[PDB]
Design a protein around this ligand. Structure first.
Ligand SMILES: O=C(O)C[C@H]1C(=O)O[C@H]2[C@@H]3OC(=O)c4cc(O)c(O)c(O)c4-c4c(cc(O)c(O)c4O)C(=O)OC[C@H]2O[C@@H](OC(=O)c2cc(O)c(O)c(O)c2)[C@@H]3OC(=O)c2cc(O)c(O)c3c2[C@H]1[C@@H](O)C(=O)O3
Ligand SMILES: O=C(O)C[C@H]1C(=O)O[C@H]2[C@@H]3OC(=O)c4cc(O)c(O)c(O)c4-c4c(cc(O)c(O)c4O)C(=O)OC[C@H]2O[C@@H](OC(=O)c2cc(O)c(O)c(O)c2)[C@@H]3OC(=O)c2cc(O)c(O)c3c2[C@H]1[C@@H](O)C(=O)O3
Lengths: 304, 304
């Protein structure tokens, strides 16, 4: 029992983290086979970041202009390609620790683990969700760019995020490993700002189910609601709409707890309308939306 | 910016996790050099756990009665010793992935990362604190016993916890790697119950400093307090006493923020007396006490 925001074990990603230096700019890179993927703005200074012409900075960059360090070992950059906002640095050595991996583009509301790295060295791992506004609420200091987000399925590391930018609001924006930013964000400073975020309703419901599974049941009311009526309430509290797909995804948790999703929705509706009156759920005084139904299932089962 | 409950990268611990089976009981073991450390109750059935005579179950256990699997590879148990509540299984192969490591006994209030494992396979990593009552609020399902807690300092893994028991209250108890339980807990079911827990004040203050560093400053009041007066308030809210040692430990955060510890204490006092009035701090509607001053410093700096 117990329910924690759990990240994936990071070892298989730790073994892929390298440091990429281009001039004075040092960020992290992901070394998979003989390619290191890193944010293209490694070629930028902080001053370049206002409105950088990347293929201009890059076209005046050579392969030798990219310095990749893995641990205490330098990899020669023997090719450089820009794919969207990621630099693919072909290196002279394939990473022996390249796990089985996939590059995936996650959907808003999905969660992944971030291995925060500085200078190619892993500092910490934490779980987070792709917000509906395509930001992530991470913990990224200067030099964490290129830190990646991932999910692990058995033996396969699905890299879904590479950290590129802290927006002026202090949330974080990045790309998939094909260098396509999540959301309307760009690797330049600009009036670029995060759009309004919303609460991931299906995750809140999953976490309420997690709460029930862990015995924190006080918020369970005696009512049910329709999906439409719940969504009217959801909307008022800046919660994403709950779709029938979400309802179906929550099916296993409903089955485990016996609580029909629409009944849980009624409970959530009441939590939204009435608040938590100083109570907590799973040690939180807020409704948590960074656990997907699958996270809840995994954590409540022994998924390794 | 951003501040997350971050765990240590788990790779160096993942490489030490093995499965230890004794009969039908399978739990996790820590494989360091040629020893696998695991909870002695691997020799227990669930029925044995009410009041197990361990050196009785063990004395009728042979070296061959212990089955250790590392990945898909069996290690022969060529010796077995019980040290307090841990079984040290001498195995025929030293773990090639044994990191530099130390066994440390942490103090209540200190935090560590847990790599939750089932059947020797890492499932997730999360950070937690040794509560003042020597429990941990983890996420442990059956079969997670032997999962370890650790901190990483540079290259050294300090193992400080091995998971042994879920208490009937749903919190978790365990030992250091010498098998000495944290707290008055025993590896037997009994009226054994967690003593009253308290909030780790110095960690709350550290997290308030983290909040200030991250720009969440609304709770900063204009007052100061004495340590004694703060402690009177702390006491009323089941907060641990703040010692001058704590104050001194918070010095670096005070220096960084300019907020004298006793001024922060005044702010915390007001938070305790008045609540948060629906506001959050670092996205939490409760005061968080699972970040030590060192965690805050590490996370707010780039410590890898
Ligand atoms: O086992 C451990 O405990 C860790 C240990 C490890 O995992 O080894 C795997 C792993 O690759 C896969 O898992 C894999 C990749 C695929 O592409 C693929 O198709 C697969 O089927 C598999 C795979 C395998 C076995 C399974 O049972 C399974 O389920 C799988 O999926 C498998 O045989 O993989 C090879 C092996 O070697 C490495 O891969 C290559 O060498 C390689 C990669 C390429 O992309 C490529 O093009 C190429 O030519 C070579 C990878 O190494 C690490 O990833 C690693 C990372 C760290 O961070 C460490 O610390 C670390 C390691 C390895 C070792 O170095 C160590 O001691 O530690
Ligand atoms: O480097 C990587 O990226 C991972 C890679 C790795 O770290 O190797 C280290 C590591 O041990 C230390 O770090 C270490 C231990 C000490 O006791 C000690 O005194 C030390 O000074 C050091 C050390 C070292 C270097 C530093 O720069 C540094 O700062 C250090 O502190 C160093 O040379 O260590 C040896 C090396 O080999 C292994 O240790 C032994 O073989 C050993 C252990 C014993 O206890 C023992 O009695 C014995 O006779 C042998 C350990 O291996 C892993 O721990 C490991 C774990 C995983 O989970 C992986 O996935 C994984 C690995 C290794 C590899 O297998 C892989 O590819 O991946």
């Amino acid at each position: 029992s117990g329910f924690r925001k759990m990240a994936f074990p990071s070892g298989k990603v730790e073994g892929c983290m390298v440091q990429v230096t281009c001039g004075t700019t040092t960020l992290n890179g992901l070394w998979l086979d003989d390619v290191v993927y890193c944010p293209r703005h490694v070629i930028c200074t902080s001053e370049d970041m206002l409105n950088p012409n990347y293929e201009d900075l890059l076209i005046r960059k050579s392969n030798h202009n990219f310095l990749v360090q893995a641990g205490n070992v330098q990899l020669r950059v023997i090719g450089h390609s820009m794919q969207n906002c990621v630099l693919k640095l072909k290196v002279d050595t394939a990473n022996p620790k390249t796990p089985k991996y996939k590059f995936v583009r996650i959907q808003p509301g999905q969660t992944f683990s971030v291995l925060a790295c500085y200078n190619g060295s892993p500092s910490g791992v934490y779980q987070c969700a792709m917000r509906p506004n395509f930001t992530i609420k991470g913990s990224f200091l200067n030099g964490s760019c290129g830190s990646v987000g991932f999910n692990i399925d058995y033996d396969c590391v699905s890299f879904c995020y590479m950290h590129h930018m802290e927006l002026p609001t202090g949330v974080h924006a990045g790309t998939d490993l094909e260098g396509n930013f999540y959301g309307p964000f760009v690797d330049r400073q600009t009036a670029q700002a995060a759009g309004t975020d919303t609460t991931i309703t299906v995750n809140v419901l999953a976490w309420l189910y997690a709460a029930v599974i862990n015995g924190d049941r006080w918020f369970l009311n005696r009512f049910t609601t329709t999906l439409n009526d719940f969504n009217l309430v959801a909307m008022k509290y800046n919660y994403e709409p709950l779709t029938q797909d979400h309802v179906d995804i929550l099916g296993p948790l409903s089955a485990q707890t016996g609580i029909a999703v629409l009944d849980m929705c009624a409970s959530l509706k009441e939590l939204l309308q009435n608040g938590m009156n100083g109570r907590t759920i799973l040690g939180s005084a807020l409704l948590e939306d960074e656990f997907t139904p699958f996270d809840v299932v995994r954590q409540c089962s022994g998924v390794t």
